[PDB]
Amino acid sequence: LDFLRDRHVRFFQRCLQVLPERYSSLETSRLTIAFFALSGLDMLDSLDVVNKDDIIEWIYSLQVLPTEDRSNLDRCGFRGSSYLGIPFNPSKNPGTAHPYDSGHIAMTYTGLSCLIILGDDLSRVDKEACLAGLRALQLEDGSFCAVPEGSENDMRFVYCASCICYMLNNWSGMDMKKAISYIRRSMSYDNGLAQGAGLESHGGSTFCGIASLCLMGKLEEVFSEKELNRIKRWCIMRQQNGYHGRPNKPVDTCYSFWVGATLKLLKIFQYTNFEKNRNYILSTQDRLVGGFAKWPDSHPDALHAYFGICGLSLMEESGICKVHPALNVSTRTSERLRDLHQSWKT
Amino acid sequence: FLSLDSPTYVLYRDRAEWADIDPVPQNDGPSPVVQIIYSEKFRDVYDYFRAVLQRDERSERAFKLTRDAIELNAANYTVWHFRRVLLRSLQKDLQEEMNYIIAIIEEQPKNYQVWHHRRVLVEWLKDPSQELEFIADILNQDAKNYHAWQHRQWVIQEFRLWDNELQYVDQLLKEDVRNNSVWNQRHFVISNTTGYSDRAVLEREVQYTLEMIKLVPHNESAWNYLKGILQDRGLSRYPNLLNQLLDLQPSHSSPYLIAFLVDIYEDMLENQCDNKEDILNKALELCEILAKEKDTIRKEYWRYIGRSLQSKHS
Ligand SMILES: N#Cc1ccc(Cn2cncc2CN2CCN(c3cccc(Cl)c3)C(=O)C2)cc1
Ligand SMILES: [Zn+2]
Secondary structure, three states: OOOOHHHHHHHHHHHHOEEOHHHHHHHHHHHHHHHHHHHHHHHOOOHHHOOHHHHHHHHHOOEEOOOOOOOOHHHOEEOOOOOOOOOOOOOOOOOOOOOOOOOOHHHHHHHHHHHHHHOOOOOOOOHHHHHHHHHHHEOOOOOEOOOOOOOOOEHHHHHHHHHHHHHOOOHHHOOHHHHHHHHHHOEOOOOOEOOOOOOOOOHHHHHHHHHHHHHHOOHHHHOOHHHHHHHHHHHHOOEOOOEOOOOOOOOOOOHHHHHHHHHHHOOOHHHOOHHHHHHHHHHOEOOOOOOEOOOOOOOOEHHHHHHHHHHHHHOOOOOOOOEEOOOOEEHHHHHHHHHHHHHHOO | OOOOOOOOOOOHHHOHHHOOOOOOOOOOOOOOOOEEOOOHHHHHHHHHHHHHHHOOOOOHHHHHHHHHHHHHOOOOHHHHHHHHHHHHHOOOOHHHHHHHHHHHHHHOOOOHHHHHHHHHHHHHHOOOOOHHHHHHHHHHHOOOOHHHHHHHHHHHHHOOOOOOHHHHHHHHHHHOOOOHHHHHHHHHHHHOOOOOOOHHHHHHHHHHHHHHHHHOOOOHHHHHHHHHHHOOOOHHHOHHHHHHHHOOOOOOOOHHHHHHHHHHHHHHHHOOOOOHHHHHHHHHHHHHHHHHHHOHHHHHHHHHHHHHHHOOOO
16 A cells, blocks of 8 residues: 555664563574664664664674683674673773673674664774674685584675675675685576575575675676576566565565665666565555564564565655665665765775 | 473572572663563573573583573574583483484474584484484475475585485475475486486486476476576577477467577577577567566566667677
């Protein structure tokens, strides 16, 4: 029907407030929920309804800073929350040593991302420590893990690594040649990109691969024109009305961004059917509580609310800022990031 | 031991065996963001979990505490890591842990942490004997579970268990020829065993796919496989294919077939074929058929492809 803008603003506001225990599984990734909410409000031009200062302090309390003896550099970055019980410290004093305290790549990414959205200048971010932490996460095959203690490794984290290097405007955080190699090896026989070599190509991993290359400014250099044409074909074939993540799977609102953003980066989103996509996204809108679900008449969540809005943004919805398809923040935010980078180079 | 919903469950703060430990609370500071409220029981388990973690206590009681922490929140990766540290320190029976994780995964098949945990265990035991059957069970409740297929490919590759996968793939394609995950598996098996350079294999596969396409002509997965195993060899290098497809157009038509033809014609133009201007027109005619009536949702795309062909071959 129509875009329930006000309701979504309230939805995101509630996400930043207090949640029922039924959401406990989000504990270690509260920072990404904050990101969906803040970046979502930013996208709707309503960051004024939140106290940017309080939130900035909270985010900084999540940074894993190097200890006095700097013997934990390989573990720096940001935590998803304070579940470890480390005493509140908004990146003021040094780092309180702890056997199992370290950053999580997706949190370092959404964390830095949130700081920029809120207006902070990243002066309290130990840039070198984060980059050291990032380097430690990369594997021999070029992909990344999420934490130094070990985890699964795939395209999702390659994207996080790329975003971090881009935001800190320093690529010493990764061995770019090896990352590119990983991205190439993930291309499937059907031409989409998978999470890793041999796996089923997917809309999410294709976005991560393509966006990473664009952030590195090496899209053209890595894939030939023929290859890019094949990838474009695979991506545009994902539209049914809304978009699905892989052949023969039902559509899900978030793919309007995962795939749509990829198509935008490949410069052919303009050739997709806007109306059917918009109609589908809006049909997953929760008219009562706000936010978007993956399917109509389904429960909404922060992730699908944010990506649904970004999907709408791709077609320039009346009332929604333009989204930077590769960085996943508002263009307004990417512009502010540009200034920040300029100001540092002095 | 003592279940979280047992009538006789006792908070850790009331257990004698935990008297010496001072619980460590979580503090989100002055103004918390995205704060989750916890029940007494929940906060109690984690207040002691933090205590044990902070002191890196490699004890048996800590090991049992992780079982409760996991029941409360299986997505906490730190808990799983610590449990692995304890499994080693206490030299626990890993065969028993396999039973544990096997049950956990069945209840939460989409959780990244539980699949990672199982993979570490299998690496430790160097025993993949249970894997293929376990995965087949999970795939039985969700034949497209990305985590299951990923784990299956890892096991097969790591312990070279290729012997029966192609047969497993054939079985699943009969159950649902539209499962894109299975078609991917098929290419995974073949390209990692015989490869496709063996003309006898390529022929067997192309023939197999055409048979599947005839059964269900509107199936992107089957068409993607067919084009996938031939595109790098050169679609135009297979004259009988072009005609066999043109013979399907009458009845077994679909946008996938039309698209395939356009791609064949494009390969021809790319290799300075005979009747360049005639071929180009055959392609353009199809692009417009796709845009105007066969794949209308991609109307603007196909027309864009058309314009691309003209400006490149004229
Ligand atoms: N990529 C991808 C992907 C994987 C699975 C899905 C399936 N899916 C559909 N609706 C929700 C989901 C689950 N996703 C959200 C994206 N994501 C992610 C993406 C990028 C970075 C990071 Cl840290 C995390 C995940 O780990 C899990 C969708 C997209
Ligand atoms: Zn989704």
